[PDB]
Amino acid sequence: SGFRKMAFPSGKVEGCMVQVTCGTTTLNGLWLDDVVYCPRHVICTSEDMLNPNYEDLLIRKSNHNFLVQAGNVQLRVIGHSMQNCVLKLKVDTANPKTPKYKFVRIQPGQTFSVLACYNGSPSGVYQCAMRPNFTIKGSFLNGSCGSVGFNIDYDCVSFCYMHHMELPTGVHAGTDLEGNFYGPFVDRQTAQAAGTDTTITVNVLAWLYAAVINGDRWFLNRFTTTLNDFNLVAMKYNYEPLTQDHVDILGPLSAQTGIAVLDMCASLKELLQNGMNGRTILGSALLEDEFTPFDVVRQCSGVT
Amino acid sequence: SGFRKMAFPSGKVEGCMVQVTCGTTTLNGLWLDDVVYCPRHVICTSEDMLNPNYEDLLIRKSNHNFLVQAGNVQLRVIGHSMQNCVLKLKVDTANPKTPKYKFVRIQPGQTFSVLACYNGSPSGVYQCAMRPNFTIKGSFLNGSCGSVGFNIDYDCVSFCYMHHMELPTGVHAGTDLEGNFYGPFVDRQTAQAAGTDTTITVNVLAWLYAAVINGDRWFLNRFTTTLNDFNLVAMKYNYEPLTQDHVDILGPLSAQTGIAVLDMCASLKELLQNGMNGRTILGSALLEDEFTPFDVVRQCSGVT
Numbered sequence A, B: 001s002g003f004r005k006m007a008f009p010s011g012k013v014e015g016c017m018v019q020v021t022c023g024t025t026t027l028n029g030l031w032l033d034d035v036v037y038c039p040r041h042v043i044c045t046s047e048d049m050l051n052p053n054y055e056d057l058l059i060r061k062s063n064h065n066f067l068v069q070a071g072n073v074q075l076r077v078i079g080h081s082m083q084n085c086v087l088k089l090k091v092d093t094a095n096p097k098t099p100k101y102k103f104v105r106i107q108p109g110q111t112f113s114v115l116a117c118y119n120g121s122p123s124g125v126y127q128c129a130m131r132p133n134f135t136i137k138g139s140f141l142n143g144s145c146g147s148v149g150f151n152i153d154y155d156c157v158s159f160c161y162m163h164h165m166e167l168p169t170g171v172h173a174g175t176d177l178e179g180n181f182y183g184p185f186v187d188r189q190t191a192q193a194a195g196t197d198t199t200i201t202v203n204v205l206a207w208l209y210a211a212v213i214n215g216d217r218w219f220l221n222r223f224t225t226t227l228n229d230f231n232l233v234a235m236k237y238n239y240e241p242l243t244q245d246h247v248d249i250l251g252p253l254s255a256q257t258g259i260a261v262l263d264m265c266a267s268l269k270e271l272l273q274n275g276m277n278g279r280t281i282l283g284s285a286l287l288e289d290e291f292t293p294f295d296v297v298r299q300c301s302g303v304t
């Protein structure tokens, strides 16, 4: 028992972290096979970041201008290319610690672990979620760019995020491993505001099921509701609308606890209308939306 | 910016995890050099756990009865001994992935990362704290015993916890790497109640400084207090008494923000007396006590 914001073991990702330097700019890179992936703004000076033309900036760069260090040793760069907002630096050595991996573009509401890195070295690991406004609420300082977000299925690492920037609001924006930004963000030092941060409803419901499994049952009520009635409440509280797909994915949690999804929705509805009244659920005084139904099942069953 | 419950990168610890089987009981072990450390209740059957005599139970066990598997390969056990509540299984091969390590017994209030494991395989990593009642609020299921808690200084892993049990209250109890339990717990299937769970005051104060650094300043007030006045409030709210040692360790955070420690104590006092009034601090609706002053500085400066 007990429920924690748990990250995947980071070992397979630590073995992929390198340092990329271009001129006076140093950030993190991800070395998989003979390719090093990093944000393209590594070629920029703070003056360039105001309005950068990456195609023109890259013309003045050769393979020898990209310095890639893996731990203590230097990698030889034999190729360089730009794919959307990431640079792919072909090196002459395959990473001997390359795990089985995939590049996946996640949907908003999905969760992932972040391995925060500085100068190619890992500093920490934490669990995150791609928000419905396509930002992440991470913990990154200057130098953390190139840090990656990922998921793990037994021995396969699915890379889903690469950190590029921090918005003036303290929230973070980044790309998938093909260099496409999540959301409308551009890799430019220009004011970019994030849209409405809505609550991931299916994840809060998954977390209420995790609380029921762990003994926290005070919020269970004698009521039920419908998808349309629940969504009227969800809209009012800036919650994501619940669909039959969401109900379907909550099926195993509903089966394990014997609490129908629409019944759990009615508990959530009352919690939204009345608040927690000074109580806590899984040691939290607010409704947690950064655990997917998959995360709850995984943690509650011990998937390694 | 951003502040997260961040765990240390787990790679160095993943390379130490093995599976230990004795009879029909399987739990986790920690392989460092030529020694495998695991909870001694691995020699018990569920019948034995009611009232076990480990010295008598160990008499019926030989080196060949302890099965140690590292990944997919079997380790040869050439020695076995009991040190307090852990078994040390001498194996014929030194772990080639043994990092620089220490065994440290932590004080209550101190934090550590846990690598939850099942059948010698890591499932997840999370940040934890040794509570003042010597329990941890972890996330462990049956099979997680032998999972370890640790801290990391550059390349050195300080092992501080080994998980042994879950109390009927859903909180966890365990030992240091010399087999001594934290708190008064015994490795027996007998009802053991934890004492009062008090709040780690110096850690809440460290977290208020992290919130000030990250932009959350609403709780800052026009007041100050004294150590004796603050502690009258702290006692009333089951908070740990604050000492000059605590004030001393908050010195770098006080210097960085320019907010005197006693001033931050007065903000904490008002937060305790008035509550958050529906507001949040670092995305939390309660006062977080599982970040030490060291954790705040580390995360806010990017120590790798």
Ligand SMILES: N#Cc1cncc(NC(=O)Cc2cccnc2)c1
Residues within 6 Å of the ligand: A039, A041, A049, A140, A141, A142, A143, A144, A145, A164, A165, A166, A167, A186, A187, A188, A189, A190, B001
């Ligand atoms: N793409 C892009 C891009 C555009 N403008 C500025 C930057 N730089 C940062 O945001 C650095 C930073 C600072 C704190 C946390 N995470 C990152 C990058």
Ligand SMILES: N#Cc1cncc(NC(=O)Cc2cccnc2)c1
Residues within 6 Å of the ligand: A001, B039, B041, B049, B140, B141, B142, B143, B144, B145, B164, B165, B166, B167, B186, B187, B188, B189, B190
């Ligand atoms: N020492 C000891 C000891 C005494 N009595 C019972 C056990 N077993 C467990 O608590 C197994 C377990 C279950 C869930 C989470 N963590 C562990 C061990």
